[PDB]
Design an enzyme around this catalytic site. Sequence first.
Site, PDB file in Angstrom:
ATOM      1  N   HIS A  54      -5.083   2.558  -6.466  1.00  0.00           N
ATOM      2  CA  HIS A  54      -5.897   3.151  -5.415  1.00  0.00           C
ATOM      3  C   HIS A  54      -5.065   3.567  -4.208  1.00  0.00           C
ATOM      4  O   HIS A  54      -5.495   4.439  -3.448  1.00  0.00           O
ATOM      5  CB  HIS A  54      -6.974   2.161  -4.965  1.00  0.00           C
ATOM      6  CG  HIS A  54      -8.170   2.800  -4.327  1.00  0.00           C
ATOM      7  ND1 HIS A  54      -8.996   3.674  -5.000  1.00  0.00           N
ATOM      8  CD2 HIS A  54      -8.690   2.675  -3.081  1.00  0.00           C
ATOM      9  CE1 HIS A  54      -9.978   4.056  -4.198  1.00  0.00           C
ATOM     10  NE2 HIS A  54      -9.814   3.464  -3.027  1.00  0.00           N
TER      11      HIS A  54
ATOM     12  N   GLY B 129      -8.097  -4.615   3.943  1.00  0.00           N
ATOM     13  CA  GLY B 129      -6.658  -4.761   3.849  1.00  0.00           C
ATOM     14  C   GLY B 129      -6.185  -5.776   2.835  1.00  0.00           C
ATOM     15  O   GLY B 129      -4.968  -5.967   2.691  1.00  0.00           O
TER      16      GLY B 129
ATOM     17  N   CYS C 199      -6.728  -5.624  -0.451  1.00  0.00           N
ATOM     18  CA  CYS C 199      -6.469  -5.009  -1.742  1.00  0.00           C
ATOM     19  C   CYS C 199      -5.034  -5.300  -2.185  1.00  0.00           C
ATOM     20  O   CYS C 199      -4.086  -5.196  -1.398  1.00  0.00           O
ATOM     21  CB  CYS C 199      -6.714  -3.490  -1.638  1.00  0.00           C
ATOM     22  SG  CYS C 199      -6.869  -2.595  -3.213  1.00  0.00           S
TER      23      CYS C 199
HETATM   24  C1  LIG Z   1     -14.139  -6.064   3.023  1.00  0.00           C
HETATM   25  N1  LIG Z   1     -13.261  -6.181   1.867  1.00  0.00           N
HETATM   26  C2  LIG Z   1     -13.218  -7.204   1.037  1.00  0.00           C
HETATM   27  N2  LIG Z   1     -12.284  -6.951   0.104  1.00  0.00           N
HETATM   28  C3  LIG Z   1     -11.782  -5.740   0.410  1.00  0.00           C
HETATM   29  C4  LIG Z   1     -10.692  -5.050  -0.356  1.00  0.00           C
HETATM   30  N3  LIG Z   1     -10.597  -3.600  -0.155  1.00  0.00           N
HETATM   31  C5  LIG Z   1      -9.602  -3.166   0.592  1.00  0.00           C
HETATM   32  O1  LIG Z   1      -8.750  -4.093   1.168  1.00  0.00           O
HETATM   33  N4  LIG Z   1      -9.401  -1.869   0.788  1.00  0.00           N
HETATM   34  C6  LIG Z   1     -10.227  -0.999   0.226  1.00  0.00           C
HETATM   35  N5  LIG Z   1     -10.001   0.415   0.411  1.00  0.00           N
HETATM   36  C7  LIG Z   1      -8.831   0.820   1.164  1.00  0.00           C
HETATM   37  C8  LIG Z   1      -9.004   1.409   2.416  1.00  0.00           C
HETATM   38  C9  LIG Z   1      -7.872   1.786   3.162  1.00  0.00           C
HETATM   39  C10 LIG Z   1      -7.654   2.385   4.453  1.00  0.00           C
HETATM   40  N6  LIG Z   1      -6.359   2.499   4.606  1.00  0.00           N
HETATM   41  C11 LIG Z   1      -5.711   3.061   5.775  1.00  0.00           C
HETATM   42  N7  LIG Z   1      -5.713   2.020   3.558  1.00  0.00           N
HETATM   43  C12 LIG Z   1      -6.591   1.587   2.650  1.00  0.00           C
HETATM   44  C13 LIG Z   1      -6.411   0.999   1.385  1.00  0.00           C
HETATM   45  C14 LIG Z   1      -7.531   0.628   0.667  1.00  0.00           C
HETATM   46 CL1  LIG Z   1      -7.286  -0.125  -0.912  1.00  0.00          CL
HETATM   47  N8  LIG Z   1     -11.237  -1.414  -0.517  1.00  0.00           N
HETATM   48  C15 LIG Z   1     -12.135  -0.431  -1.111  1.00  0.00           C
HETATM   49  C16 LIG Z   1     -11.717  -0.053  -2.541  1.00  0.00           C
HETATM   50  C17 LIG Z   1     -10.526  -0.494  -3.080  1.00  0.00           C
HETATM   51  C18 LIG Z   1     -10.194  -0.145  -4.376  1.00  0.00           C
HETATM   52  F1  LIG Z   1      -9.020  -0.563  -4.920  1.00  0.00           F
HETATM   53  C19 LIG Z   1     -11.038   0.651  -5.126  1.00  0.00           C
HETATM   54  F2  LIG Z   1     -10.684   0.983  -6.397  1.00  0.00           F
HETATM   55  C20 LIG Z   1     -12.229   1.105  -4.593  1.00  0.00           C
HETATM   56  C21 LIG Z   1     -12.561   0.743  -3.294  1.00  0.00           C
HETATM   57  F3  LIG Z   1     -13.728   1.168  -2.738  1.00  0.00           F
HETATM   58  C22 LIG Z   1     -11.436  -2.723  -0.715  1.00  0.00           C
HETATM   59  O2  LIG Z   1     -12.363  -3.071  -1.374  1.00  0.00           O
HETATM   60  N9  LIG Z   1     -12.362  -5.271   1.480  1.00  0.00           N
END
Ligand SMILES: Cn1cnc(Cn2c(=O)nc(Nc3cc4cn(C)nc4cc3Cl)n(Cc3cc(F)c(F)cc3F)c2=O)n1
Lengths: 302, 302
Positions: A41, A143, A145
Site C-alpha cells: 500500500h 501510522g 501500517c
Molecule cells: C486507525 N488505524 C488503525 N490501524 C491503522 C493502520 N492504517 C494505517 O496506519 N495507515 C493506513 N493508510 C495510510 C495512510 C497514509 C497517509 N500517509 C501520509 N501515509 C500513509 C500510509 C498509509 Cl498505509 N491505513 C489505511 C489502509 C492501509 C492499507 F494497507 C490498506 F490496504 C488499506 C487501507 F485503507 C491503515 O489502516 N490505522
Amino acid sequence: SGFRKMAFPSGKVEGCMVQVTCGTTTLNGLWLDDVVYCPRHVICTSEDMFNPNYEDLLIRKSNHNFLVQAGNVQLRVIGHSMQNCVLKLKVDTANPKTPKYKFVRIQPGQTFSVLACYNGSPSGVYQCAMRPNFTIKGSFLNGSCGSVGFNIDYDCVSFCYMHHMVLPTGVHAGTDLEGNFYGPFVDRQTAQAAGTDTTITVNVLAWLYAAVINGDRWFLNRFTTTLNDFNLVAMKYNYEPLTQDHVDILGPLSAQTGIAVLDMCASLKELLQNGMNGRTILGSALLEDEFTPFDVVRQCSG
Amino acid sequence: SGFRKMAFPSGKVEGCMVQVTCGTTTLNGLWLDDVVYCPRHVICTSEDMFNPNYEDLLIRKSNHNFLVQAGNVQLRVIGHSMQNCVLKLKVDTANPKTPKYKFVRIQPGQTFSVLACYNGSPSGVYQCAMRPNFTIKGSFLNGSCGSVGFNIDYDCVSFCYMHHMVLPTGVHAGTDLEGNFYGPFVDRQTAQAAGTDTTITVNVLAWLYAAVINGDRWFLNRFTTTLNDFNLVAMKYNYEPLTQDHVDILGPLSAQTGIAVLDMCASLKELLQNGMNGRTILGSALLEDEFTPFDVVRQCSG
Ligand SMILES: Cn1cnc(Cn2c(=O)nc(Nc3cc4cn(C)nc4cc3Cl)n(Cc3cc(F)c(F)cc3F)c2=O)n1
Ligand SMILES: Cn1cnc(Cn2c(=O)nc(Nc3cc4cn(C)nc4cc3Cl)n(Cc3cc(F)c(F)cc3F)c2=O)n1
Ligand SMILES: Cc1ncc(C[n+]2csc(CCO)c2C)c(N)n1
C-alpha cells in the site's frame, strides 16, 4: 502466581523496524538481512488508495522512489519486487541485528505478540489472537501500517502477521509475511466487514483452568456433559466446536488441577446459559478467549 | 473496547538483564554501565532466608563469591556494596547496551512495564499498576526475583520496580532501584499480608475521560463538587482520595474534552452512589482503574 496477558520480549524485532516512504505515503517496514518487507500500500498516492492497481503502480516505480530510513541512516534500495500484498525492497546493507527468523502462517485461535510501531519506531507491545473470522482486536493508530506480529521459540522469531488496515468496527486486518491476507480482505481503502466472529472455545476453557490454578472456583459444578452435547450448546452460542485434539491439548491443565476437561465443559455450558450473575473471573466480567492452553501452561506451571 | 494493556518495547531493558548467583541462591540482576543491581536476598542460604542478618551475611562475602553472568559469559565483580535492600556489584565491563536511564520511585496508581526474567533470560513483558496497598498484581514464578519494572519516555528508561517476593494472596512486592520497598514489606521469607486495597480514583477518572473521548458520555451529570467533598465521599466507597498531583495529571484530558476535573468527579460520585443501573461504559459494567491519564492519551492520541 498471577495471570496476565504477556507478550514475548520485543527486542529482537525492534532491531528490525524501519520507515519506508514513497512520495508522501509512509509506513513501517521489517528489515531482515538485505531485504525490507512492508505493505505494498505504501506505493499508493492519496488518489490510489481507494482502488489501486498495484502491478500498474509498481511498474511505474524505480528504486529511487523508495526512501528507507533506519533510525537516521538512509538505506539505498537496489531492487524491488512484490509478493502478494508485501513489497520486498532489496537494500545494499545487511541488518546486523537480524535475528534467527521464520515466516509462518498462524491458525485461528492462536496467539502472537504485536510490536506496534509509528514511523519505523517501536511504540508498544501486546498479545493478540487470530480471531476465527481472521480479524485481530489490536491497538493501532494511524501510522501503524507495517507493524508486525510474532512468536519467539528458543531465540528464533517466527513472524506471522503484518498489519495493514482498520475495519469499520475497529478490529484489524493484515497479512502473513508472504503477503496473503488473513480473511476475505483486500488492501484498498474501502469499508470492509468481516464474517461473524465466534468465540475460541478451547481458549476459554484454558483460561477457566488458569482461574482455578489462581484460586477461583466459583463457576465449577457437579454437572456432566459429553463432548457432543457440549458442542451442541457451544454452537448455539456462536462458540467454536471443541475437538478431541483440543481436549488432548488441555490434558496438562486437567492433570494439574484434577478437573476433567469435560467437567470444565460442563462449567462453561452453565456460564453460557446462566451468565456470570455480576461475578468476575480473574477480574474479568466477560469470558476471555485470547489465552491458548500453551499461554496458560507457560504462566501457571508449578 | 479499543483499549488494551500495552507494554513498552522491552529491548532496551533486555540488553541489561543478567543472572546473579551466590552459592546456589540465584536470581536476576540489572547491568547498567559498570554496576549490577540485584536484590540483596541473593546472599541468603536457604537457612538464612527466613530471618537473615544481611549485615553479617555480607561481611563474610568477598567479590569472588559473586557469580554474575550475561548469558554464559561471566562478568568479573570488582567491588560490592549494600544499599537498603539492593546489592550493587561493581563489574569490570561497562555494559555496551546501557540505555539512557533514570531511577524513579513511583506513586500508587502509576503503571509500568514488567520484563519477567528467569535465570537472567527475559521471558515476557506486561503492564502492571502499583496498587494503593503497594502490591502489584503481576505474573511471576519462582526464579523471577530481580525482574524489573520500567517506563520509557522518549529514549530514557525510568526504572521504578525490582521484584522481590510473592505474598500469601499471590500478589507481588518489591522495591525501587535504590532498594526501598514499596509498602511495609521486608525482605524475609515470611508470610506478610498486604493491607486492604482500594480503587485508584485518578485512573477511573482517566477511564471516564477516555469514554468521553470516544463518544460514550451518558454518565456526565449537571453537577460539580469540591475536591474535599469528593475525597470524603470516595473513601466511603473504598476509593482513594485525590491529590493535587492527581488533579494536575488529569489536566490534558480535561482540556481535550472540555470537562472540568471537578465536574468529572461529580459524575463519578453519582456512579458510586447510584451504580450503573444495568448500563455500561466503554462496553464494560466494571470501572477500570489500571489505565493512567498518560496511558489514555497514549492509546487515544499517540
Ligand atoms: C486507525 N488505524 C488503525 N490501524 C491503522 C493502520 N492504517 C494505517 O496506519 N495507515 C493506513 N493508510 C495510510 C495512510 C497514509 C497517509 N500517509 C501520509 N501515509 C500513509 C500510509 C498509509 Cl498505509 N491505513 C489505511 C489502509 C492501509 C492499507 F494497507 C490498506 F490496504 C488499506 C487501507 F485503507 C491503515 O489502516 N490505522
Ligand atoms: C512464585 N513467585 C512469584 N514471585 C516469586 C519471586 N521469588 C523468587 O523468585 N524467589 C524467592 N526466593 C528464592 C529462592 C531461591 C532458590 N534458589 C536456588 N535460589 C533462590 C532465590 C530466591 Cl530470591 N522468593 C521468595 C523471597 C524472595 C525475596 F527476595 C525475599 F526477600 C523474600 C522471599 F520470601 C520469591 O518470592 N516467586
Ligand atoms: C491517513 C490518510 N490517508 C489517506 C486518506 C484518504 N484521502 C484523503 S483525501 C483523498 C482523495 C485524494 O486526494 C483520500 C483518498 C485519509 N483519510 N487518511
